[PDB]
Amino acid sequence: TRIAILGAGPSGMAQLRAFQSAQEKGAEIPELVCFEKQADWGGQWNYTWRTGLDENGEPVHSSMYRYLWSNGPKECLEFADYTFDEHFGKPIASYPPREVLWDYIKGRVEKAGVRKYIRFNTAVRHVEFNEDSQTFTVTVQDHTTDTIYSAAFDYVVCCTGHFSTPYVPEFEGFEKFGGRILHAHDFRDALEFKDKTVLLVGSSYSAEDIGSQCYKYGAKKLISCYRTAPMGYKWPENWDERPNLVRVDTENAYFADGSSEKVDAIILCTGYIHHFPFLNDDLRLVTNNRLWPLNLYKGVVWEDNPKFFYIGMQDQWYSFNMFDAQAWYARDVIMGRLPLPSKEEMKADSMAWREKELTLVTAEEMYTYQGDYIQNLIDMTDYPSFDIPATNKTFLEWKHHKKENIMTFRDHSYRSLMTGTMAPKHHTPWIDALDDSLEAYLS
Amino acid sequence: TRIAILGAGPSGMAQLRAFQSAQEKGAEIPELVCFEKQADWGGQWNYTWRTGLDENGEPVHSSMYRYLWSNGPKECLEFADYTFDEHFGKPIASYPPREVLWDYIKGRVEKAGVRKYIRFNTAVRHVEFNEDSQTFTVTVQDHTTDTIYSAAFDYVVCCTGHFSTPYVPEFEGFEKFGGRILHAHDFRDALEFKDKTVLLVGSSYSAEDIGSQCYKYGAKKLISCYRTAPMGYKWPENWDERPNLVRVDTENAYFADGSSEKVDAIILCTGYIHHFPFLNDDLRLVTNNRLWPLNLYKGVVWEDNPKFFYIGMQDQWYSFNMFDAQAWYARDVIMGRLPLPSKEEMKADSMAWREKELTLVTAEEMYTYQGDYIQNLIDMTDYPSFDIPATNKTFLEWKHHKKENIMTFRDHSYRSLMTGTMAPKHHTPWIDALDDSLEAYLS
Ligand SMILES: Cc1cc2nc3c(=O)[nH]c(=O)nc-3n(C[C@H](O)[C@H](O)[C@H](O)COP(=O)(O)OP(=O)(O)OC[C@H]3O[C@@H](n4cnc5c(N)ncnc54)[C@H](O)[C@@H]3O)c2cc1C
């Protein structure tokens, strides 16, 4: 019996780690093959200067940029089976830069010895399910050998992420505008916008952080514009929030204010779409970005074909943590440890979760909900229980530190829920920490 | 009997025109379905401000930019069945802007009434050939309905182009550089580089023209770097050619000169790759960009499966013209008018064309070769013969005007080979024609 794992970001890495853990405790595991289009693992966390399409012509995956740091508390994404203490050997602050968390997630799978299951530089083209043999044919392109080939699997776990294919709306006059227009997905070095005026269309995490990054590295002026409601924070002197963009000139932007501004560049921070070009409608998840997509029993088993799974397709307050709980659950169903109920029962269960999701009003209610979801998963499994209510509270602190001051939220510290140890303050306040390297953060 | 045409650029447009022409002369034609991922026809010639991935997540197709004009004589790409005189009603100059040639190619297919065969906003996912039924299954995603479906065809003609998926080599230090790095494919408005220093990596048509465009719209400084040999032309005061880039700094570029320069942005003009993600190895053309790719009988019939065709996959001195000769040939084989020889004979014929291709040294020998190729095609077909040697000579003039002065080559005029009428001088010299619109060019 044979499993295909699509992708080697945190989620695929988690899926390999789950099986390896079960084998380490003496269980007999299926054969595993994992396909990844990049040359190395880490998903989003593997930085690249590339843009649009990669060296092989596949859409560039990572949306990450220079100077990116964790945007939530480290301790809200710690692995229950592999702690920050184990990995780094010393305590570190709470909002590590990209390279540091990349080093961290690699460390777990390095220790586990699961690299050997991965075929890198290989893009998944198609997954078909055969009624007759009751198996999946996965067709891939190996860009090392420039060969296209297919292989047969009994179950498939899709871990290809949903923050990679941009949602890019059009505004009137974009075809006339003289400056750069880009989506957040293409943002790389904040220095390219030094001494320039940047319009940021959108009001979520990308808007906040890309603006923050441009501010930090010396842009002249920043303008956020919002669709429904204002971001709400106290922005520095050279950053305004305006109602939505309506049109654009050779050099100006016009808003629902009636106001006007000369603008050098426009960065669309409008989010992403769930896009699976390697799947037909029988297997293909269709959803907007939300806490409870439909058709996923326990949020991971595909209801129209329960031998196909999805990891991490929910919107994210929790992350690494959650993928783990998902991957452990996926594995125990694949291994026959947790038999699936009937299709009617699955659908009724998923309806209950959707009813509750539509109930949610406040940030607190939302991550508490994801908290409840994760709790339900970890209770069914091998995976070590940890203090979820206490993680929720850590989120609550985090939200407060953002309300207090949006530029200084990364200068606070929190208690690890795995080890119990309060994180130290970092050696340099965020505003002044211009060097984003692992090197400089750990020294 | 039923045909699938993949793409509605010049080539797919030509393929539909070919069939329509045969029906207009009273022949019974097959059913035609043409699939196009954009919302309108024209291929490269349909401009978009978009970059990387389009509103549906498909790779953005067009490589074209603001202010692009024909880079060869108009009269070298005139349709033999639909003249510039017929379309515009007046004589026009010889290097029309993008919008003008777009208007022109649309005109032929507007007159022909072939739009009705096209499914726009539909991306081709996969083409399989079935041994049992001797037919092709084409799977597509309709982004209007968000549905994925498949349909059966007896022959397939692939017209998806080969100047869209960038070849993007890496140079040391790109992950440290502070400015924008982009491939020519992502170049949009030359105004974004006003008063800046731009490095152009490459030594072909994109290098020449993107530099030219940046110069024309007010860049501070330009640097071309070449892999094998220098471009050769006399560049204006603020533009140097130096040997290849070796590495890059936070803000500087270093060359095999040993020389150094502060640089604001890097535009890789390093060309494209043949990429067909919708095809398996049984159907998939693998080739570098050249005058005579292998495995294409008469340069269009796929030798391992002669019910599958390729249009326009050769490198291009001729263009529109050539696609016509190819499409007319494809059609006459599909229609049984020109029976295919045996596989051995096809391979031997292709070998002879390859032998000759490797003989070619000079620009003149090269386009004369493609001229001979086109001649061989049009003699086998319905398609009106026209003076190819005289078109060759028009290319020769064109090359001379480029050697004379690379910035003024677009200010010359040539004799139409269809109508025989010398083109008038344009109303504004190229350097001063800042407005790129159809509107402004025809007034
Ligand atoms: C800019 C940005 C910043 C973020 N910052 C944080 C943060 O600070 N903290 C946090 O908790 N979360 C953050 N996230 C959320 C992020 O989704 C998770 O941290 C995590 O990366 C999810 O991992 P994943 O493996 O499920 O998806 P991904 O990390 O996207 O991995 C998907 C993998 O699948 C591969 N793949 C996709 N298609 C194919 C194909 N056809 N064939 C082969 N391989 C394929 C990709 O190469 C990739 O490796 C951020 C997300 C973005 C976009």
Ligand SMILES: Cc1cc2nc3c(=O)[nH]c(=O)nc-3n(C[C@H](O)[C@H](O)[C@H](O)COP(=O)(O)OP(=O)(O)OC[C@H]3O[C@@H](n4cnc5c(N)ncnc54)[C@H](O)[C@@H]3O)c2cc1C
């Ligand atoms: C920047 C640039 C400038 C150029 N300038 C000139 C010039 O001045 N003069 C000249 O003679 N030639 C020029 N060319 C050469 C150009 O190749 C031809 O002029 C002509 O555009 C080739 O047409 P085509 O139909 O064969 O390919 P394309 O024009 O590229 O059309 C291919 C079509 O297939 C579609 N497609 C691709 N994949 C899919 C899919 N999977 N599903 C559905 N549809 C798909 C695309 O949307 C596109 O419409 C230029 C090329 C480039 C890149």
Ligand SMILES: NC(=O)c1ccc[n+]([C@@H]2O[C@H](COP(=O)([O-])OP(=O)(O)OC[C@H]3O[C@@H](n4cnc5c(N)ncnc54)[C@H](OP(=O)(O)O)[C@@H]3O)[C@@H](O)[C@H]2O)c1
């Ligand atoms: N580590 C980091 O610092 C960091 C940085 C960036 C991103 N990320 C991660 O990336 C993920 C997504 O971040 P995200 O903000 O890009 O996606 P997102 O959370 O879905 O944000 C979507 C935003 O786009 C806006 N939008 C959509 N259409 C619009 C339109 N037509 N006009 C104006 N606005 C429009 C939405 O407006 P409405 O609110 O009105 O619907 C919303 O503000 C998150 O997990 C986040 O953690 C992390």
Ligand SMILES: NC(=O)c1ccc[n+]([C@@H]2O[C@H](COP(=O)([O-])OP(=O)(O)OC[C@H]3O[C@@H](n4cnc5c(N)ncnc54)[C@H](OP(=O)(O)O)[C@@H]3O)[C@@H](O)[C@H]2O)c1
């Ligand atoms: N209408 C217009 O004005 C216009 C503008 C742009 C493009 N186009 C069209 O687009 C098509 C392609 O033009 P193109 O120039 O982008 O593709 P191209 O003609 O294949 O040019 C390829 C170039 O990339 C260079 N290159 C490849 N790898 C390199 C490396 N590692 N380092 C440095 N240089 C490298 C090659 O160097 P080598 O020479 O050593 O091999 C060559 O100079 C042509 O049909 C052209 O008509 C038209």
Ligand SMILES: [Cl-]
């Ligand atoms: Cl272990």
Ligand SMILES: [Cl-]
């Ligand atoms: Cl007609």
